[PDB]
Design an enzyme around this catalytic site. Structure first.
Site, mmCIF file in Angstrom:
data_model
loop_
_atom_site.group_PDB
_atom_site.id
_atom_site.type_symbol
_atom_site.label_atom_id
_atom_site.label_comp_id
_atom_site.label_asym_id
_atom_site.label_seq_id
_atom_site.Cartn_x
_atom_site.Cartn_y
_atom_site.Cartn_z
ATOM 1 N N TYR A 53 -1.602 -0.008 -9.498
ATOM 2 C CA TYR A 53 -0.953 -0.676 -8.369
ATOM 3 C C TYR A 53 -1.691 -0.391 -7.052
ATOM 4 C CZ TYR A 53 2.976 -3.282 -6.374
ATOM 5 O OH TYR A 53 3.768 -4.221 -5.744
ATOM 6 N N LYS A 95 3.065 -2.316 0.041
ATOM 7 C CA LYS A 95 4.504 -2.457 -0.176
ATOM 8 C C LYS A 95 5.287 -1.375 0.555
ATOM 9 C CE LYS A 95 4.960 -6.085 -3.038
ATOM 10 N NZ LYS A 95 5.540 -7.380 -2.555
#
Lengths: 255, 255, 255, 255
Positions: free
Chosen positions: B155, B162
């Site tokens: 990720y 995020k």
């Protein structure tokens, strides 16, 4: 001391009243050898004086906005130190308007870009450039603030950038941890000092912390410094990907 | 339904297998009138077809990389709707290398910049451009993932972006809340679908969630959609600055 | 409504000014059939009147201090309902001294015991007794407060008990989730009402929330009620082990 | 060392393979004078031997189930030490069934009561009894586990109790902090040792931590010990109400 033999590079030492200076003092006290970065030729004199206070003549320019300077920093350091044991990242910037008043008023694509570039990107960018010369037990430390976790007045775009920075601590810890390298942040409380030109007054927050924190007192650069020295040391070998609050416990109350 | 009369703009509807499509279906079911954005002329046909499925002919181009397009989006929408009640932000991007393998391998200043520009900045940028036409009880919703909170393999740079996005939810909530506007995120679990070209396989994570989540099942776009519709509605008038996990409870266990 | 056909048991409805009453009103509005518990024969009249307001004649005694009463509650309910779809747990108690002034002054082994027995243990105890008659898509909801997460003045031993309660939400979610049952809490903000005899004034906290929360307003029982109805419904099928703040966003700021 | 002159009482030293023993070794190394508690006459010999390893002859009985014993502990200690600088709380218990298999199977009112009494209540109970003789810069440390924060298999009722314990750290920090006393927990990772009779195997969790933690290794009692010594020392004067993970970073990943 508990940092005997450790060689540590510190960024962001701008005055004797800041956290970086406190970390430097604690590290030197515990036996570390230190080196420092500065931004801009006009201020090389200043950082040389500060470094001299810690028995260091190792000072290097590094504007983290510039890839070439980040690479050259570690090339230069390597001529003196074959390995690096510690990195202290105390760099952060946002344009004045992006950290004053309303969050949206100060929001522009460029303001956002700069704040994240300088305050968040610079940490893993330095880590990546340093990586080949890092010792297996090296420790990388950055500084954050509660405004990453919860919304604090005026902090605005810096809160976004510090949130990205704390996430980078976790991803860096995974990337570097197989080698043995640790990566942590200290979420520091405000220091009793006058806020810099452009920055809104710390007065209200300092009073609120003194009145509401469990210890009923603001944190000092000595306290943040000693916590930083701990995280940079083998005493903290079991600690990584951590955001440690050094804030008189303020984060843990509803004031 | 519980969204009767609400007018909602949705971004990021790329296929019928995604969260945005699920949110659109739930919103339409509960009485909302919908409008949609798309990126790129070649795909206007596609989004027009999707919008038609929800009884909408309101589709507008918006590349969030471009300030002028963000401004024009709301100018165009305003010719149809004098007020906007809801915004769904489902936009996110990072270059392939920045979300594959090692975090540092994929880290470059430009990769970092793009990921944060498109995935984090775009949310408060849209909010700021929409602000004058927002109703007093408007609700802005973005989508996040557990990788913002904890490090998840591959990720990488998206986890940083995020994290900044979730912080923006808090700062936006404060900026817009005096007017009455709410701002929230859903931290969604992975959907049972094939990962797009460039993105690493979801296979292992999907299996791990199915085996370890409290509900022993992956979340569906229907479930994320119904939660989104709730947050966009007056049912959620007491809820703001929240990151709501809609992930079968996976975030709450150690698998 | 979105709770059509659902049968829901509510505990802790003591007056028309409380959260349980708000949850009951929202549930009834959305189509639920309701049942209620009460403590003590002298107050059966009261709860019968309240239940009548929601079209219910199903009221049962249950002192959660007594195992036999917890078991008998569900035996009695089962004579009317072959299955239970929802449980609302709004029960909490600590001796006056254990929730006033200094934490240690009010700390005794018995005060601690009672607070945890009534405020934490009772939730999974009710869940365990209800388990055989729970529907596969049942939803169990408890109420908590920010004092579980951070230290709030006067909250003291109740903060410990609510922390245990929120942990029970996670463990219950795992225990019951394989069957399909969901378990969540709402961390509610304070309601604008006069604090009960023994409880310290809410005045200061209510003012502080109104002045500092993102929405600049205290939460209402209507808002907490609508959020509760959502969590009890199939709209929230993807949500479990969650502690959802319904508090005007207050938890997310530093006031 | 950095604990020169500090006098520290340690509970829960049952063997040379546990965290308490590691904390004792680090504290002694850094200059602390130590004292120890034990439970049960048959085991006084054992603890006397352990204490002797740290240059201590100060051992006292204390069953934390008994108020009179908690009071007598500090009366006895005070005959040797006019002030206490540190307390290490490493006591925890739940009946076997309450920490094995399904959460509800092992849940009984008495199991819940005992687990919370011994594992949570005992910490602030000891703090309250010690309070008059605590130095102004005293530091109280307890041990917790990730199962307080997230649901971990088998941990069950202990997860509830540890959640209450971590909340007690916050409330204690506020109660004692005006005087200057600090209160913290270490959330420790599992130690590579065979689980005690009754306790389920640590094998799977140890392997999972070694494979998934950022440092790709389990934490050692030396590492937890050094972190504990830090928190007990004036190096950590700015740190209170903190739950510090010493777990190779495992808490920060999704494995």
């Amino acid at each position: 001391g508990f940092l005997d033999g450790k060689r540590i590079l510190l960024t962001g030492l701008l005055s004797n009243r800041s956290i970086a200076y406190g970390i430097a003092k604690a590290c030197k006290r515990e036996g570390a050898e230190l080196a420092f970065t500065y931004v801009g030729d006009r201020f090389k004199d200043r950082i040389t004086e500060f470094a001299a206070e810690f028995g260091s003549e190792l000072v290097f320019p590094c504007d983290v906005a510039d890839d070439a300077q980040i690479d050259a920093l570690f090339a230069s350091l390597k001529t003196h130190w074959d390995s690096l044991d510690g990195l202290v990242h105390s760099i952060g910037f946002a344009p004045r308007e992006a950290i004053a008043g309303d969050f949206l008023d100060g929001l522009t694509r460029e303001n956002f870009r700069i704040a994240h570039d300088i305050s968040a990107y610079s940490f893993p960018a330095l880590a990546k450039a340093a990586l080949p010369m890092l010792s297996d037990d090296a420790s990388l430390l950055t500084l954050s603030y509660l405004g990453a976790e919860r919304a604090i007045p005026n902090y605005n775009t810096m809160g976004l950038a510090k949130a990205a920075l704390e996430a980078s601590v976790r991803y860096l810890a995974v990337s570097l941890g197989a080698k043995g390298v640790r990566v942590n942040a200290i979420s520091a409380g405000p220091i009793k000092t006058l806020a810099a030109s452009g920055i809104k007054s710390f007065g209200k927050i300092l009073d609120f912390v003194e009145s509401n924190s469990p210890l009923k007192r603001n944190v000092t650069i000595e306290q943040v410094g000693n916590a930083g020295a701990f995280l940079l040391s083998d005493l903290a070998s079991g600690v990584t990907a951590e955001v440690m609050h050094v804030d008189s416990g303020f984060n843990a109350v509803v004031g």
